[PDB]
Design a binder for this molecule. Structure first.
Ligand code: HEM
Ligand SMILES: COc1ccccc1O
Length: 403
């Protein structure tokens, strides 16, 4: 509809999945709020627009169309008002910093050592599948009460939910262009129900210290639990992004450090720099790149665009974190970048609830990795490809080291 942006009509879903950064560089210069036809939605590409939409009193949360098709109702990311307040009160106890500090080290550190012990003397590894993803899912899986779900299965589930959630391509009529792309999401959810329904059955009668047991019981009148249909969409929110993103974040941080070998040596020599390295890694390739959204609740003007009430806006935080209004040469990883606010955890009432936990999982994992393999080198015989528009990270990270 907007004549000067007619080139957007030719942007494809595959191009956004393989490398969204070229199109979004144009968006940030040309139209910080722009309707992208293949996504069927306005997209916010700059830091100022993302932060304004995420915190505006005239916007509320909405799930993207493919996200809603995947999660249903009431996903914590997609609801507001009393339901959102309840779901936030449900998830927040185990994520409170003082609580996380009581047990996070005893949780993640033995998990990291267990996965490292399987390959640390091989001289070669593919760190995404052998380390980053397993540590991420095994840590959260144990916290949740899914100790008996193998890390292979948790990784499979978040990959299928990822592809379903981000199956966003639409045709000229706004209809999903890839309707068969939700089937593996439905298949994953069916498997999850078969595993988790008996656990919920048991937790209702015998509560324990698992997070999902507390989701059922916390804050309820005596003898009542939250209905499982009411909590399952937030279980799915966890089984996608909460399982996937810490692994994405540590892997992207490592890829960034490899691209600056002198900074990798700095961080290995001084592991107190690991949190700073992770924060730059999240800015450099944001794990949640363009997954979440808001919807206007009244007519509003954003970036010169007069939006009617009921207008969805996708928050492309991964693009906002390359805003050259904030950063110099943002496409380069730089451990010594002047620390600034970033949007990798979002903003507003629907900002990430698990920031403190996630940073600790990533930090401890990198601590243990650099301790066990101080001479880690990237396998330059292999290249690192990143994939994903909604959620983005490296598909593999081949490394070598002298044994
Ligand atoms: C590096 C890892 C992670 C990153 C980069 C990340 C980032 C994000 C982002 C961008 C959002 C959407 C915010 C918005 O729309 O403004 C979000 C939401 C959320 N995240 Fe995180 N996340 C990570 C890990 C986790 C973990 C491990 C958990 C749970 C233990 C978690 C729990 C949540 C929840 C519950 C929400 C929904 C909040 C709401 O809608 O009220 N996240 N996260
Ligand atoms: C924390 O997990 C999510 C965040 C935003 C969208 C989907 C998710 O599963």
């Amino acid at each position: 509809e907007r004549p000067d942006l007619a080139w957007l009509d030719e942007v494809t879903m595959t191009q956004l999945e393989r490398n969204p950064y070229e199109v979004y560089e144009r968006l940030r210069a040309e139209a910080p709020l722009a309707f992208v036809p293949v996504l069927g939605s306005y997209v916010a590409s700059t830091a100022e627009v993302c932060r304004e939409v995420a915190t505006s009193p005239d916007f509320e949360a909405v799930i993207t169309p493919a996200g809603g098709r995947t999660f249903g109702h009431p996903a914590i990311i997609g609801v507001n008002g009393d339901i959102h307040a309840d779901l936030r009160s449900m998830v927040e106890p185990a994520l409170q910093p003082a609580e996380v500090d009581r047990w996070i080290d005893d949780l993640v550190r033995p998990i990291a050592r267990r996965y490292l012990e399987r390959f640390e003397n091989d001289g070669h590894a593919e760190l995404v599948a052998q380390y980053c993803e397993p540590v991420s899912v095994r840590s959260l899986g144990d916290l949740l009460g899914l100790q008996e779900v193998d890390s292979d299965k948790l990784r499979e589930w978040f990959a299928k939910l990822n592809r379903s959630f981000t199956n966003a391509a639409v045709d000229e009529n706004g209809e999903f262009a890839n309707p068969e792309g939700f089937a593996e999401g439905d298949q994953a959810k069916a498997e999850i129900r078969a595993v988790v329904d008996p656990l919920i059955d048991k937790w209702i009668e015998h509560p324990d210290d698992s997070a999902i047991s507390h989701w059922l019981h916390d804050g309820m009148p005596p003898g009542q639990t939250r209905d499982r249909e009411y909590i399952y969409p937030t279980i799915y929110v966890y089984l996608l992004g909460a399982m996937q993103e810490p692994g994405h974040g540590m892997a992207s941080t490592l890829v960034g450090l490899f691209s600056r070998p002198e900074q990798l040596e700095e961080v290995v020599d001084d592991p107190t720099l690991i949190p700073r390295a992770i924060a730059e890694g999240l800015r450099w390739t944001s794990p949640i790149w363009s997954a979440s959204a808001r919807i206007s609740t009244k007519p509003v003007t954003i970036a010169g665009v007069d939006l009617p009430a009921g207008t969805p806006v996708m928050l492309s935080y991964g693009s906002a974190n390359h805003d050259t209004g904030k950063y110099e040469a943002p496409s380069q990883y730089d451990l010594h970048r002047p620390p600034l606010p970033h949007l990798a955890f979002g903003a507003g009432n629907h900002a990430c609830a698990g920031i403190y936990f996630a940073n600790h999982v990533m930090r401890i994992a990198l601590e243990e990795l650099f301790e066990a393999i101080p001479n880690l080198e990237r396998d330059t015989r292999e290249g690192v490809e990143f994939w994903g528009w909604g959620f983005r990270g490296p598909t593999s990270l081949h490394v070598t080291w002298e044994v």
